[PDB]
Amino acid sequence: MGRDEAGITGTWYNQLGSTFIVTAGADGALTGTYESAVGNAESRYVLTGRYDSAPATDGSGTALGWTVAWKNNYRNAHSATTWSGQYVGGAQARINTQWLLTEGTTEANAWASTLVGHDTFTKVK
Amino acid sequence: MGRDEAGITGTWYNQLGSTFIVTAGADGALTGTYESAVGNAESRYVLTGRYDSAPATDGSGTALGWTVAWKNNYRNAHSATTWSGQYVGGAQARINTQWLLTEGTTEANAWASTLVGHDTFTKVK
Amino acid sequence: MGRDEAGITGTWYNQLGSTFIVTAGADGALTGTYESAVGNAESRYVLTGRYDSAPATDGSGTALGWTVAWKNNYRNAHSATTWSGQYVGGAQARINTQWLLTEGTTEANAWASTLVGHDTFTKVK
Amino acid sequence: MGRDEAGITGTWYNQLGSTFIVTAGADGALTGTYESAVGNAESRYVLTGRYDSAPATDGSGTALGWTVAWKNNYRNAHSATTWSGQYVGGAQARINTQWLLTEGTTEANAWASTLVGHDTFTKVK
């Protein structure tokens, strides 16, 4: 099994009240659903990603990332977000991320295609 | 089939000489392998991601993203990169991305965990 | 006077324990000193930047940014950080930022030149 | 004089056709004007920033950054951009940057306040 397979798998919540539901595979896979509390979004969207299944053993975090494309049966926001970050285990486990949200644009508006921000996920709230 | 399923699927090369091999599914999935020409990397790494399978029809690009965790049978760089960007079709097709590379760190060094940059992928070179 | 000239001018502290000392001019100027609690840094460094001296009047924040080059009489880290963010006034005033830290590199290592992160500044602590 | 004071001072142009006019001081200062070819902008805006006046002497670039707040006598876009990057000297001199553009927002829309991108400046075109 991945070192943090058990710690990462489950339901996570960020500071916006979004819900991240993920399964970590032994092989480094991340698979699940994302529900945003904000933006041009409703209900759940597919996600996929990857994590380091054999991290450093020195109080270092575990590197991971995932993608959501904002198309489901209800809406299409013609956009994708990627989260890149690290999982930190323990009584107050956290996933600390930075993200990039790209919208499809014309070539003329491509300079303004990409938002950046940061989300912190916890197992409570 | 996804609108750009045929256009995205295949082999892509970036400005560093890295090789991105991807299959786009009808359902929005991206699955393949990445080989970096730079950094703490050798040979191929698994990737997964998502794309907008029903983009805007107005000369807009197609939003997508993917993740690589830098662990394979040869090396573990305890890090993950996410690319967020858009596919632009046509005779000079391109995937224009920005990326976030997070390394696992101690809590003390977490301020310095994440590199940002930009890659442009073409079907030639 | 700038709308938030009085609110921005003074001493601010971030989550790392760094100290940001700034004077806001009527004309949109920011001038002061920065002392980092982390990294290849000691004592104070010059900063300069700009802010919106006539912001929206609808509970919107006030856009601003500033730069530090990490050279002073004690050390040279051959690097610069820019903070881009917004000032939010009131009893719990905050400056919410994202930053980009670029180091001088060779052309070969330029893909790895730039860190990204986020700092929140308060008037206490 | 700063090592690259002479190389940085002057008129630069990016891939969008924007014009960056800067004076580098011996002391690490950057002062000038910016004119954007895109966005909610017209004519010139004040900029200020900083550069490493004593860079590494090994074919390394010179770290720098600057800020524009998008208020002038003609328009106010309630936003600021910071560019963070490095100057590379020689026959094809370049300033390679990444930027963060923050708009003033309500607290509810603050997750969507900040665009990220990349500009390359040359002395021609």
Domain range list for chain A: 1-125
Q: Backbone breaks in chain B (C–N > 2.5 Å) follow which residues?
A: none
Q: Which chains touch B (3 or more CB pairs under 8 A)?
A: A, C, D
Find chain D residues with C-beta within 8 A of C52's C-beta.
69-71, 76, 78-80, 104
CB-based contact A116 D112, cutoff 8 Å: no
CA proximity to A82, closest of B51, C97, D50, B108: B51
Beta carbons of A39 and D112 less than 8 Å apart: yes
CA distance D125 to chain C (A): 22
Neighbours of D5 (CB within 10 A): 17
> In which residue are the tokens 């070179």 written?
B125
CA atoms within 13 A on the CB side of B63: 25
> Which is nearest to D30 in space by CA: D19, D40, D39, D21?
D21
User: Which chains share 3+ C-beta pairs under 8 angstroms with D?
Assistant: A, B, C
3-state secondary structure of A55: coil
Report the C-alpha gap between A4 and A25 in whole angstroms: 10
CA dist D57 and A12 (Å) reads: 48
CA distance C33 to chain A (A): 26
The pair phi, psi for residue D29, each rounded to 5°, is: -75, 145
Which CATH number is correct for A1-125, 3.30.750.210, 3.40.50.300, 2.40.128.30, 1.10.540.10? 2.40.128.30
Whether residues B115 and C117 touch (CB distance < 8 A) is answered with no
Residue B34 annotated as binding?
Answer: yes
Experimental method: X-ray
Distance, in Å, from the CA atom of A47 to the CA atom of A80, rounded to the nearest integer, reads: 10
Per-residue tokens: A120: 């912190």
State the number of CA atoms in the 13 A half-sphere of D8 facing the CB: 32
Candidate from B63, B103, B107 with C-beta closest to A103:
B63
CB-neighbour burial class of residue C125 (10 A; exposed 0-12, middle 13-18, buried 19+): exposed
* Burial class of B68 by CB neighbour count within 10 A (0 to 12, 13 to 18, 19+): buried
Mutate to test the interface with D, among B116, B119, B120 (most CBs of D within 10 A): B116
Q: Which residues of D touch C60 (CB under 8 A)?
A: 78, 104-106
3-class DSSP assignment, residue A36: coil
Output b/e per residue, B85-97; b: 16+ Cβ within 10 A.
bbbbbeeebbbbb
Quick one: tokens of C38? Answer: 């982390």
| Nearest residue in chain C measured CA to CA from A97 | C117
By CB atoms closer than 10 A (0-12, 13-18, 19+), residue B60 is buried
**A chain contacts of residue B104, beta-carbon cutoff 8 Å:** 52, 55-56, 60-63, 86
Residue A112 phi, psi dihedral angles, 5° rounding: -105, 25
Q: How far is CA A118 from CA A19, B7, D83, in A?
A: 15, 32, 19
The enclosing H or E element of D31 equals strand D29-35
C-alpha of A114 from chain center:
17
User: D76-88 and D10-13: which strand pairing?
Assistant: unpaired
Q: Which residue of A has its CA nearest to D14?
A: A111
* Rounded Cα gap, residues A81 and A119, in angstroms: 12
First to last CA, chain D: 28
- What is the resolution in angstroms? 1.4
Instruction: Please identify among residues 79-98 of chain D the ones whose CB lies closer than 8 Å to any CB of chain A.
Output: none
User: Rounded to an integer, what distance in angstroms lies between the CA atom of residue B9 and that of residue B32?
Assistant: 10
Q: Which two tokens stand for residue A121?
A: 């996920």
Q: Which of A111, A114, A117 sits opposite D111 (nearest CB)?
A: A117
Compute the count of residue pairs across chains A and B with CB atoms less than 8 Å apart.
Answer: 198
**SS3 (DSSP) at D23:** strand
SS3 A109: helix
Q: Which DSSP state fits D123?
A: S
Residue D83 token pair: 């560019």
Calculate how close chain D gets to A115, using CA atoms only, in Å: 4
Bind-site residues of A: 34, 45, 83, 99, 111
Cβ atoms within 10 Å of B8's Cβ, excluding its own? 21
What is the CB neighbour count within 10 angstroms for residue C22? 23
A100 neighbors B98 (Cβ within 8 angstroms) = yes
Q: Which of B97, B98, B101 to mutate to test the interface with D (most CBs of D within 10 A)?
A: B98
Nearest CA in chain A to C119: A118
- Does the CB of D104 have a partner CB in chain B at under 8 Å? no
Rounded Cα gap, residues C100 and C104, in angstroms:
13
Task: Look at residues B106, B99, B105 and name the one whose alpha carbon lies nearest to residue B38.
Answer: B99
